[PDB]
Amino acid sequence: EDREVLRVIFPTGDSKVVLPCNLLRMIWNAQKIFHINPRLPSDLHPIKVVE
Amino acid sequence: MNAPPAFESFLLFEGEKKITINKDTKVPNACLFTINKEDHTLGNIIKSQLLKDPQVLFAGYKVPHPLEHKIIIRVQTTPDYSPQEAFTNAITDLISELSLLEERFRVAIKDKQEGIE
Amino acid sequence: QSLETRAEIQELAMVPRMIVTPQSNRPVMGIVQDTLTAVRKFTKRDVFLERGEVMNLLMFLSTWDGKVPQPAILKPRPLWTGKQIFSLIIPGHINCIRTHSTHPDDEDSGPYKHISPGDTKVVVENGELIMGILCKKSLGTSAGSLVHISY
Amino acid sequence: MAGILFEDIFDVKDIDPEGKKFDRVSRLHCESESFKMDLILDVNIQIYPVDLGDKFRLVIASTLYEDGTLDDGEYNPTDDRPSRADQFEYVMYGKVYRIEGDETSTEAATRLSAYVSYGGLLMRLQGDANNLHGFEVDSRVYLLMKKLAF
Ligand SMILES: [Zn+2]
């Protein structure tokens, strides 16, 4: 549903919008600081994420 | 006008002292020497004599601002050997090299030359 | 002329606080002129420094922890690379990506031809410069820049 | 002596890929005599004159001062412990930034590439035997290059 609304917001279909808080850069910081191994299985339950 | 008198470039001020020593706390066994009214002529040479010494871990100098006659020397040595002694020795050593250079020069001039004086 | 106005300037108008402008949410100031050309020249992968030159540069830095990093080349003689010394300057863990986009490498499809590092991408991680030359695109007043990420 | 992460004797396929070439630093393209591992690596050709016909010995280690860690940094010229992989003609210190193979498939996790950075001198290895030793980790890994054999 959000995807469908978002197409109406940007009919010209540009991917580049101004927003606060760089989420990719923060997530990227989480991997770098906690030393998360990309190969090892993660220790996170998805429902915790959604909530 | 605001230009200093040019002699103020090298004469020590009556309320100042020639060298000052302060400890650094960032790392153990290290020192910061302040040389006032001195320039690259002195600062650069003392850096090279210290780096020659193998007990010295780090040595460097920086003139904090060009308009301001003063240099700082950071030196760091092994725990087994005080950094102050290396500096004193480094000057004396340097004094010795220049003295030998002066004796060899006068003698070299003394070599079969004419119009030497 | 007062403590209230001195407080108001120190807190509101003072230059480290005028850095990222709201005029167009990118930094107002970045590295300029002669230094900027010297930074380009310096980060190239071919720059190497002896123990003396590194100690001299370390001596000019400000927040330097005091621990000389291990040179990227130990043998046959000690050598520090340019990027490496630069990594002492980059704050705690500031981390960019991309921003390679000079006229060096390819108008894009070349780098995908497998990441033959080419030598132009600017990658930094945990506040340590991993690879690639710095320039107007990284340090300049461009929205995506290194100076933007520090602030 | 350091716990060996990787060890092999390599042959040079080419010294100038694309051929573009530059000063002081040069990019080697190599292949391991096991013929199961590939290598791309920068070296300081100004202080280590490589040749196209040369056959090199390469070693990768997680430490030097024997077995304990060295994460102190601070190269410490005053050490004298013969623990060192010092017999080698060319040694570099550096960090790993990427490692990097197909894992999407069934089981997969087969065939692997490591990217290493030695202060801006880049390295790339392909394998599968280094699967226990490649890690995207802090500045820790050393490349020791030696002898260039005969
Ligand atoms: Zn374009």
Curated annotation (Swiss-Prot), chain B:
User: Where is this protein chiefly located?
Assistant: nucleus
Q: Which residues form a coiled coil?
A: none
Q: Which GO terms describe its molecular function?
A: DNA binding; DNA-directed RNA polymerase activity; LRR domain binding; protein dimerization activity
Cellular compartment(s): Nucleus
- Provide this UniProt record's keywords sorted from A to Z: Acetylation, DNA-directed RNA polymerase, Nucleus, Transcription
* GO cellular component terms attached to this protein's record: nucleoplasm; nucleus; RNA polymerase II, core complex
User: Where are the N-acetylmethionine modifications?
Assistant: M1
Its GO biological process terms? transcription by RNA polymerase II
Cross-referenced Pfam families, in alphabetical order?
RNA_pol_L_2
Oligomeric state and interaction partners are given as:
Component of the RNA polymerase II (Pol II) core complex consisting of 12 subunits: a ten-subunit catalytic core composed of POLR2A/RPB1, POLR2B/RPB2, POLR2C/RPB3, POLR2I/RPB9, POLR2J/RPB11, POLR2E/RPABC1, POLR2F/RPABC2, POLR2H/RPABC3, POLR2K/RPABC4 and POLR2L/RPABC5 and a mobile stalk composed of two subunits POLR2D/RPB4 and POLR2G/RPB7, protruding from the core and functioning primarily in transcription initiation. Part of Pol II(G) complex, in which Pol II core associates with an additional subunit POLR2M; unlike conventional Pol II, Pol II(G) functions as a transcriptional repressor.
- Annotated function: Core component of RNA polymerase II (Pol II), a DNA-dependent RNA polymerase which synthesizes mRNA precursors and many functional non-coding RNAs using the four ribonucleoside triphosphates as substrates.
The entry's family comment says:
Belongs to the archaeal Rpo11/eukaryotic RPB11/RPC19 RNA polymerase subunit family.
User: Under what name is this protein listed?
Assistant: DNA-directed RNA polymerase II subunit RPB11-a
Give the lineage. Eukaryota, Metazoa, Chordata, Craniata, Vertebrata
Q: Gene encoding this chain?
A: POLR2J
From Swiss-Prot, chain C:
Task: Identify the domain of life.
Answer: Eukaryota
> Subunit details for this protein?
Component of the RNA polymerase II (Pol II) core complex consisting of 12 subunits: a ten-subunit catalytic core composed of POLR2A/RPB1, POLR2B/RPB2, POLR2C/RPB3, POLR2I/RPB9, POLR2J/RPB11, POLR2E/RPABC1, POLR2F/RPABC2, POLR2H/RPABC3, POLR2K/RPABC4 and POLR2L/RPABC5 and a mobile stalk composed of two subunits POLR2D/RPB4 and POLR2G/RPB7, protruding from the core and functioning primarily in transcription initiation. Part of Pol II(G) complex, in which Pol II core associates with an additional subunit POLR2M; unlike conventional Pol II, Pol II(G) functions as a transcriptional repressor. (Microbial infection) Interacts with herpes simplex virus 1 protein ICP22; this interaction causes loss of CTD 'Ser-2' phosphorylation from Pol II engaged in transcription.
Instruction: Describe the processing and modification events after translation.
Output: The tandem heptapeptide repeats in the C-terminal domain (CTD) can be highly phosphorylated. The phosphorylation activates Pol II. Phosphorylation occurs mainly at residues 'Ser-2' and 'Ser-5' of the heptapeptide repeat and is mediated, at least, by CDK7 and CDK9. POLR2A associated with DNA is specifically phosphorylated at 'Ser-5' of the CTD by CDK7, promoting transcription initiation by triggering dissociation from DNA. Phosphorylated at 'Ser-2', Ser-5' and 'Ser-7' of the CTD by CDK9 (P-TEFb complex), promoting transcription elongation.
The family assignment reads: Belongs to the RNA polymerase beta' chain family.
Protein's organism: Homo sapiens
Cellular compartments annotated: Nucleus; Cytoplasm; Chromosome
Span covered, complete protein: 507 to 657 of 1970
Query: Under which name does UniProt file this protein?
Result: DNA-directed RNA polymerase II subunit RPB1
Disulfide pattern: none
UniProtKB/Swiss-Prot annotation, chain D:
What molecular function terms (GO) are annotated for this protein? Answer: DNA-directed RNA polymerase activity; single-stranded DNA binding
User: Quick one: where's region Non-specific ssDNA binding?
Assistant: 16-40
One Pfam entry name: RNA_pol_Rpb8
Q: Where in the cell is it found?
A: Nucleus; Nucleus, Nucleolus
Q: Does the keyword Nucleus apply?
A: yes
* Major localisation: nucleus
Q: Which Gene Ontology terms describe the biological processes this protein takes part in?
A: transcription by RNA polymerase II
Disulfide links within the chain:
none
Q: Which GO terms describe its cellular component?
A: cytosol; nucleoplasm; nucleus; protein-DNA complex; RNA polymerase I complex; RNA polymerase II, core complex; RNA polymerase III complex
Tell me where in this chain the PTM N-acetylalanine is found.
A2
| Keyword Nuclease annotated | no
Keyword set, alphabetical order: Acetylation, DNA-binding, DNA-directed RNA polymerase, Nucleus, Transcription
Give the family this protein belongs to, as stated in its UniProt record.
Belongs to the eukaryotic RPB8 RNA polymerase subunit family.
User: Subunit notes for this chain?
Assistant: Component of the RNA polymerase I (Pol I), RNA polymerase II (Pol II) and RNA polymerase III (Pol III) complexes consisting of at least 13, 12 and 17 subunits, respectively. Pol I complex consists of a ten-subunit catalytic core composed of POLR1A/RPA1, POLR1B/RPA2, POLR1C/RPAC1, POLR1D/RPAC2, POLR1H/RPA12, POLR2E/RPABC1, POLR2F/RPABC2, POLR2H/RPABC3, POLR2K/RPABC4 and POLR2L/RPABC5; a mobile stalk subunit POLR1F/RPA43 protruding from the core and additional subunits homologous to general transcription factors POLR1E/RPA49 and POLR1G/RPA34.
Primary role: DNA-dependent RNA polymerase catalyzes the transcription of DNA into RNA using the four ribonucleoside triphosphates as substrates. Common component of RNA polymerases I, II and III which synthesize ribosomal RNA precursors, mRNA precursors and many functional non-coding RNAs, and small RNAs, such as 5S rRNA and tRNAs, respectively.
Name of the molecule in the record: DNA-directed RNA polymerases I, II, and III subunit RPABC3
Name the source organism: Homo sapiens (Human)
